[PDB]
Amino acid sequence: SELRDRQAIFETLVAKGRELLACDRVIVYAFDDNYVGTVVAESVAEGWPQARDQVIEDPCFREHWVEAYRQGRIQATTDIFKAGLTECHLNQLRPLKVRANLVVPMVIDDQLFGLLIAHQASEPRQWQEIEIDQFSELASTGSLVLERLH
Amino acid sequence: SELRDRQAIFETLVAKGRELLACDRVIVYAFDDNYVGTVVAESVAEGWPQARDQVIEDPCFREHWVEAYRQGRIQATTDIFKAGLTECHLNQLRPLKVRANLVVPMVIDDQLFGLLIAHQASEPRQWQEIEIDQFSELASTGSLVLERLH
Ligand SMILES: *[C@H](c1[nH]c(/C=C2\NC(=O)C(CC)=C2C)c(C)c1CCC(=O)O)c1[nH]c(C[C@H]2NC(=O)C(C)=C2[C@@H](*)C)c(C)c1CCC(=O)O
Ligand SMILES: *[C@H](c1[nH]c(/C=C2\NC(=O)C(CC)=C2C)c(C)c1CCC(=O)O)c1[nH]c(C[C@H]2NC(=O)C(C)=C2[C@@H](*)C)c(C)c1CCC(=O)O
Ligand SMILES: [Mg+2]
Ligand SMILES: [Mg+2]
Ligand SMILES: [Mg+2]
C-alpha cells in the first residue's frame, strides 16, 4: 500500500539519519492538510523520551514557513535556550529533552510533505556544514524515492 | 510489485549518484546465485556506450570478495590501466569504457545484493574521501529502503 511505502521510507530515514549524525533522536514530522504535525517515525537512543505517534499542533509552519521549506529552507539551532524562542515553542521541546536541532524539508512533487528533524538531547551542538549536507541529502533521497514509487 | 519498486529505487540511485559525482556513468550491478552480475540500472553521460542490460560474469567476487563487500569493502581505482589487471578484466570493461571506477556495496538482509558503481571513462580520477562517503551512504540508504519496503 502507499501508506506502507511511505512508512518504510520514513523508518529508513530516521534510522540512517541518527546513524549519520550520532545524535539522540531523528524523526519524521509529517503534515496533514492543515500542517498539523505527527511524529510518524522515530529513531531514538536509549534513555530519551519517545516522540513517536505524538501529534503536535504548531501553527508556525502553516502560518509562516510552508513556502520557505518548500523552497529548501534548512534550520539549525545550536542551543534552543539561546535562540529567542517563546515559552510556547520551548514547551513543545522540553518534554523531549531537545537542546539542539536540525530541520530539513521533505518535498515530494513540489509539496511539503513533512520535516526530517534531528535532536541533540540535554546538550548543545553546533551542526557542521557537511553534517547538514548529509542530512539534507538523506531527506532529498528519501523524497525522490517516494516521488518515483507512485 | 517488488520488481517495479526495485527499478524505481535503482533509477533514483543511479541518477543521484551521477549528479553527486559528476562522473560519466553510475550503474546498479545486481548479483544472482552464481554471483553473476546484471547491470539493472544506468545513468550515463553523452557519448558513452550504454552498459544497461549487460550480464557480466566476473568470478572474482564469489571467489574472493563477497563477504568483504558485505562488511563494507569498496574498490576505488584512479586508473584501471595502472592497477595490475589481467586481460580478462580489461576485456570485460573495454566495451563500456572505464578509466577509473568506484565500487560500493548494496547489502540487504545481511546479504550482498549488488554493487553501486561509478565510472570515469576518458581520464583517471582520484576519488576523494567525501565522494566515497557520499556514494557509500547513497548505496546504503537505497539498500535499507529496499530492505524495509518489503
Ligand atoms: C515555528 C517552529 N516550530 C518548530 C517546531 C519543532 N522543532 C522540533 O524539533 C520539533 C519536533 C519536536 C518541532 C515540532 C520549528 C523548528 C520552528 C522554526 C521554523 C524555522 O525557523 O524554520 C515556531 N513555532 C512556535 C510555536 C508558538 N507560536 C505560536 O503561535 C504558538 C501557539 C506557539 C506554541 C505552540 C514558535 C514560537 C516558532 C518560531 C517563531 C516563528 O517562526 O514564528
Ligand atoms: C575482481 C573485480 N572485478 C570487478 C568488476 C567490475 N568493475 C566494474 O566497474 C564493473 C562494472 C562494469 C565490474 C563488473 C572489480 C571492481 C573487482 C575488484 C574487486 C576488489 O578487489 O574489491 C577481479 N576480476 C577479475 C577478472 C578475471 N579473473 C577471473 O577469474 C576471470 C575469469 C576474469 C575475467 C572475466 C580480476 C583480474 C579481478 C581482480 C583480482 C581479483 O580480485 O581476483
Ligand atoms: Mg506496492
Ligand atoms: Mg559518516
Ligand atoms: Mg510520483
Ligand SMILES: [Mg+2]
Ligand atoms: Mg525486508
